[PDB]
């Protein structure tokens, strides 16, 4: 089971990299766990877009304050 989880996580990371999704292994695992727990995919997609916008705003704020 552990080897299967590792293989699935590696496949997901590779897919995210090839698709340029910007997801890391931890974020991808969190998204997978949320989807497995029944989160609405439309809500999840909106959340992902909002989180990406927030991450870009936070990175811009950190670069402006540094």
């Amino acid at each position: 089971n552990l080897n299967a989880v590792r293989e699935t996580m590696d496949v997901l990371l590779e897919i995210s990299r090839i698709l340029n999704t910007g997801l890391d292994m931890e974020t991808l695992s969190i998204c997978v766990r949320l989807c497995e727990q029944g989160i609405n995919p439309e809500a999840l997609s909106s959340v992902i877009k909002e989180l990406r916008k927030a991450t870009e705003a936070l990175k811009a704020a950190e670069n402006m304050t540094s």
Partner: peptide, 14 residues
């Protein structure tokens, strides 16, 4: 994953 369709849809949407 329990909801493969939902995760695939999310990944496509993102």
């Amino acid at each position: 994953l329990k909801n493969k369709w939902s995760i695939l849809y999310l990944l496509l949407s993102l």
